[PDB]
Amino acid sequence: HMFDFQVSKHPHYDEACRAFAQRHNMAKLAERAGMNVQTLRNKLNPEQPHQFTPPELWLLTDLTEDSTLVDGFLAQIHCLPCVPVNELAKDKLQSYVMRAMSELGELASGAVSDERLTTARKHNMIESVNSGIRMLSLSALALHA
Amino acid sequence: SGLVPRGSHMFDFQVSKHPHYDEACRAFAQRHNMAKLAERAGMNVQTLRNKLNPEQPHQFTPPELWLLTDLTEDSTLVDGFLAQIHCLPCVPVNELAKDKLQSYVMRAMSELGELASGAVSDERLTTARKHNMIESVNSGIRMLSLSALALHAR
Amino acid sequence: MFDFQVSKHPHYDEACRAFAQRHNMAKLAERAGMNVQTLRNKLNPEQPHQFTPPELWLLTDLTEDSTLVDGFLAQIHCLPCVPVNELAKDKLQSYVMRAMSELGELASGAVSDERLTTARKHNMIESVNSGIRMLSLSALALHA
Amino acid sequence: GLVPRGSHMFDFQVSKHPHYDEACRAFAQRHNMAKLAERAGMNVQTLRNKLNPEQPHQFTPPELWLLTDLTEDSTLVDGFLAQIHCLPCVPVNELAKDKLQSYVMRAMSELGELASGAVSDERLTTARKHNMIESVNSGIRMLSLSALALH
């Protein structure tokens, strides 16, 4: 229901900015992003007070397909790296909710065992988690119809 | 436009045409008392509201996003940030209970049940109602992701 | 959700008439600690006398006859009652987890009208029965 | 204590737990007894005495149907049935074949509510316990309707 979100004291986002800066050409990237080259360097420089805006983070992650800035952003608050999702919702919201209940029922079914949890059963339960996550994401996209 | 085939799933982290982060900002401003939050965040309250308003140029820095999430225990802004680039909501693991798979599964049912509640409701969808079902979706994704990590002990 | 409505068919009146004819009024009245004429008037729809809930429970338990309760339920468009006598030996969360599995299999069916069939109905009914049992046991576990 | 357990053989045994009395207390606390008494056409103090276990007054069958009709709340009927070890009531006057998916999703909501209390670290007060029993009875109601929706 609730979580205790904490801010890590390890420079996850700062170290990610340095790696991103060293991975791509700052000159081309700043032009593609509509930014001045020095401003992009300052926003990636932890020793400079300049910071990215959210749309600047989206654009540079979009233009590069590199989640380094987002992964370090998420690791700064003890969160796992980001997961890309890009599929459309072609069915009604109600159908996605019901299929999510079926996948969750199989996860609960495997969680009460009733048989030895082999490698195949653990993999099938991971697939149910993968499908349940997929049905939940599409449920959210059905709300944007 | 309309004649180039669907070309956005071939690329990762594409900026969505939907204003996910802007909708998340407005829902966040509605839920929390801005005066009390700005006092804890050490910022002016009007500047906080401007950072939550798309029509104003003020925007959050990453340190402020981490701070607001920490202070409110609300991942709405982060989850909207991630939805803006076609990503799943965030999954915190600082409280990961490796031997509590059953707890994560039951908390997933609580979120799925609240999602199901909104789906069968005959009420006109309100932005608050839409975002509460979004939150239930993101909460369910969180419990399911944590369930997978907790599966290692079972 | 539900729009409970009182039926205009006297389902409870006919249940009382069938109950009074089935059992011996003299023995049943003294077994329930009630006057025979009072019991007859409580079963006679033409008489204003009515049963209290304690009197309905007692007569149902004494006779093992759900006729009065089923007619009581049919008066508000409810199905006949279902007795359960199983004990709860397991913890609350174990029942809820097993309830998710049955509801998931029930939710596995439906969704798409296309599969349909009758074999799927039987397994969906089976999941419904197991789910009801898990929910009923959960209520008994709540009385710790 | 040496006679074997035989309560599972006899149906409709009257429970020693005050199921119906607890339901009367929860019903009286949820609705205002002055407005409902006017809708029911009965005296307010007479209505409160029938919902009060420490008072000899009790409801008649027509009064129980009437209140269930006016309130759309099956609390009194479900407590009535639980007193003789019976499942809660299932209304069928709105049963429809095309309502199957709605029945299943409502059951998910009730099971989700029960799942919340089952993982809660806070102590279960009788008000919190009553909300879970309520969700149990509603869930059983939704599951039964799902079975009847298949005919």
Curated annotation (Swiss-Prot), chain B:
Transmembrane segments: none annotated. The keyword DNA-binding applies. Signal peptide: none annotated. GO terms for molecular function: DNA binding. It holds the Pfam family Phage_CP76. Coiled coil: none annotated. Keywords: Activator, DNA-binding, Early protein, Transcription, Transcription regulation. Involved in the establishment of lysogeny. This is Regulatory protein CII. It comes from Escherichia phage 186. The lineage of its organism: Viruses, Duplodnaviria, Heunggongvirae, Uroviricota, Caudoviricetes. The gene is CII.
UniProtKB/Swiss-Prot annotation, chain D:
The keyword Ribosomal protein does not apply. The keyword Nucleotide-binding does not apply. GO terms for molecular function: DNA binding. Keywords: Activator, DNA-binding, Early protein, Transcription, Transcription regulation. Involved in the establishment of lysogeny. This is Regulatory protein CII. It comes from Escherichia phage 186 (Bacteriophage 186). The gene is CII. The chain holds residues 1 to 143 of 169 of the full protein.
